[PDB]
Amino acid sequence: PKMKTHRGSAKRFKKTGSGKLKRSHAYTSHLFANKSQKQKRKLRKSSVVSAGDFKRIKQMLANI
Amino acid sequence: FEGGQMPLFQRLPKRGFTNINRKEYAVVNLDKLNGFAEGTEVTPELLLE
Amino acid sequence: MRVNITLACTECGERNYISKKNKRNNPDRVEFKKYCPRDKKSTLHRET
RNA sequence: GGGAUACUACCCUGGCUGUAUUGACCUUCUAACCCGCCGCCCUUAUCGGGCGGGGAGACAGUGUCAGGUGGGCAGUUUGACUGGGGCGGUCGCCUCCUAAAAGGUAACGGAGGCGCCCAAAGGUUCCCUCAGAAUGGUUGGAAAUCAUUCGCAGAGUGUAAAGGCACAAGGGAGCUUGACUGCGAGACCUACAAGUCGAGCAGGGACGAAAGUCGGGCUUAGUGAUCCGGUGGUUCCGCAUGGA
RNA sequence: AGGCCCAGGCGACUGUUUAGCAAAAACACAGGUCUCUGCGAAGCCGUAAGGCGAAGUAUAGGGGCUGACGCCUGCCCGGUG
RNA sequence: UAUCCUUGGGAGUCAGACUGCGAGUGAUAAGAUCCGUAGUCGAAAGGGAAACAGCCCAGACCGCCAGCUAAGGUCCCAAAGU
RNA sequence: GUGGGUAGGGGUGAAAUGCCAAUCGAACCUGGAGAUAGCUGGUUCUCUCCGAAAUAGCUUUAGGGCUAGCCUCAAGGUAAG
RNA sequence: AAGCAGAAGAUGCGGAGCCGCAGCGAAAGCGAGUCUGAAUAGGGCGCAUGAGUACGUGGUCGUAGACCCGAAACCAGGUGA
RNA sequence: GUGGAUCCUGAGUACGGCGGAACACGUGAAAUUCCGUCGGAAUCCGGGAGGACCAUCUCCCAAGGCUAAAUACUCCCUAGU
RNA sequence: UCAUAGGAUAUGAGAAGGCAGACCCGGGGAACUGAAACAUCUAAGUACCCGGAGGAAGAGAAAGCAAAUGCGAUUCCCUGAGUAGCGGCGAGCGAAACGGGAUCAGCCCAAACCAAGAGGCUUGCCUCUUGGGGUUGUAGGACACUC
């Protein structure tokens, strides 16, 4: 059996150049009146999965 | 699975869509054009051959 | 007690600002002069 | 008195009669459906099934849908720490001590607080200064309000503790909304997720003449993932095309 | 081929039951009481045809409770049914 | 003195214990519990303390009928000074 | 005594959770089925080199798991240590 | 590759397909730049510091019972008074 | 083969409501196929589809049947590996 | 005692039952397990039970696929692709068309209309069996002109 990808993570991560992963940010769904503006605008931008989580994850996103 | 700790993909939100209409164009840069001779006609079919 | 207020503007409808207010202390519909991005200038803002 | 509306034909000021449809109360019958009613026959048969009589009767039953009831029955759940479990208490965040003069450091170790509040208790500009005590003065004092003198901070600093604050971060006055948008060199902390600071840049401000300050509170608490759904804007996509 | 007597609980009694730890004060019991059911009774088995009830008819059946017999069986319908 | 960083492959580990010293809780009780720091055991045999994991001295690549020694000891058991 | 009936999300039961082929809080046999088992036990030839941890965080988590720390191997950077 | 020839073979044919050589943005799209942003500012992302593919061994992972034995128990179908 | 006044081209059928099933598609933006109940057309100027739906455009004519080969599988039998 | 039920007689290489524990259709149809609990989901339309036939069965000639100087029955294999999607958007589930290969068969009805016979008559509104009458979408066939 050819191995199934994981759709829940395929809907959330993108494989950039040089093999890293592009991820969104948490804490951006429905609580915004309470957080300061600075953390909100930093939170709008995207980030990249760290090394240990990548070491765990790499297998589960093998097929882009 | 990380011991019942609510995993990373769950902690992370979802991103945008994809469309059925997606025209990925066949890339070629100018350096590949130097292989063909001077004064020649190039067409996608000749690119294929 | 404090209620969230979403600010709006007449000189352009699309507005975004979230603030807090006391219904004892400001029962009346508050106004504030602020900088809208899309009007690219400082405008006067009501709330909804 | 305002338009007294006196010879289109107004809507009816809303009234009812006669015509074609719909619900309950009504009585009937064939005529459905039923008869563990009777006579005959199929047939030496208390099965059923043909006729006839009768009784019921558009009810019932049955089919589909819907609501209620329903441990009669089925699948399951009922947390963890724990000086054995149960019972008690606790579960997140903030402050101090424990903490061994960097940071960190446990226990069902020792003490408190938080799930807010503030259209000003902000931002700028400008100006001051406490608490307490002594002495006089009435209603009036143990202290209400004045006057003098002493008075480093004992008083405040929205709120718990700690740190710091009188060149104010304490108090008073005017103006105003920077409790702005796009950011952000770098830096701390951290398993990750997170959290925190940040010069400076751009646009447009506020205060002040200016230098300059301002991306909330004097700092540290005053708060929650994702999915899903609502609302507003969109120069995005929208299954042949154009829309939705 | 009976030991007996005097008292007291408990259960009226003969009876039945945990084969293979418990024969008992446990269950049954006659009696009492409440309740449902007018006969294609109710209730039960089965999806249903069929049945049991019953080739019976409120002096009969079904269920609950109490348990011979004697004397009795008080108050409360706020709650639940 | 030479071990440090980055990346990648592959792990096991989440019950620790004791002895010092510095604290808690406890009754400044425990071979108690829970911390910081150091060592040993863990995963380390040999000599000493009678025997003994954590105490003291000291690290086993093998062989030798070689010497010097650390802790400890030298009347004998039992090696060395009555 | 004999001949029959009642079958396990059942039957029976003068009612104990009894009995239903020495088995009963759900009989026996086969199949799903090599059920699953964060748990216990076991895991087979040799030498050489290096050589741990029993910590923090989070977890319906506490004897489990993941990341970080600690180990090994390889390639770089080389001299930062 | 499937497939077609070929000693169950090798090998021949078979370019459909697959992966790289270009990324950036959710996308329209743009392009060694792209996105965000009003910005020719800043920032993020591979820039510029050009090797992958195919196959074999080995290590590891996934899905299969996947390292070996072990339940109590569940369901379906039958067999017994 | 031409012409095309007139007639026929599968009725309780498509389709819809309600409650379900199958389509990878768990009611969702839910097309499409089928089941049960109830309702219920069109007839060539007619109908159906093109993943809600509507207009244009394209394709097609349901509610009638039959149909070999490439396919699956070995209790067997023959000859081999 | 209209006439049917029913009854009686005769004719029937007619059916039943078994089978290969395989393969295919239907009808009916679980739980353990996974989700580190669990009900949605998964296991799985699996096992199992029933019915039926075949040596293969089903499917099959477009109310299709698709969006172009377009293909033209099904089926099956590679590819598409673990992609698009679905999903307490969890666990997991998961396609199709285009392309390449094996194979290659396309046909027959009902309706219109005509002919007779089939009677009811309310003189074609319907018989029933033949043949013409025919299977069709930039429509075809009946209908008047053709071997």
Give the number of other CB atoms < 10 A from CB of residue B33. 10
Closest residue of A to C18, CA-based? A33
Q: Where are the alpha helices (DSSP H) in chain A?
A: 7-10, 37-44, 51-57
Q: Do B12 and A23 meet the contact criterion of CB atoms below 8 Å apart?
A: yes
| Distance, CA of C45 to CA of C35 (rounded, Å) | 9
Say which experimental method was used: cryo-EM
For residue C18, list chain A residues with Cβ-Cβ distance below 8 A.
Answer: 32-33
Torsions phi, psi for C43 (to 5 deg): -130, 165
Using DSSP's 3-state secondary structure scheme, residue C3 falls into strand
Tell me the two tokens of residue B29.
């840069």
Most distant pair of Cα atoms in chain C: their distance: 34
Question: What's the reported resolution, in angstroms, to a tenth?
Answer: 3.6
For the CA atoms of B9, B14, B19, B24, the dihedral, rounded to the nearest 10 degrees, stands at -60
In the block, tokens 């809907």 appear at A11
Residue C41, H or E segment: strand C41-47
H/E segment holding residue C29: none
**HSE-up (13 A, CA, CB side) for residue A40:** 10
Place of tokens 């508050």: C30
In the structure, how far is the CA atom of residue B15 from the C1' atom of nucleotide H26, in angstroms?
A: 6
Strand H proximal to B44 Cβ, under 7 A: no
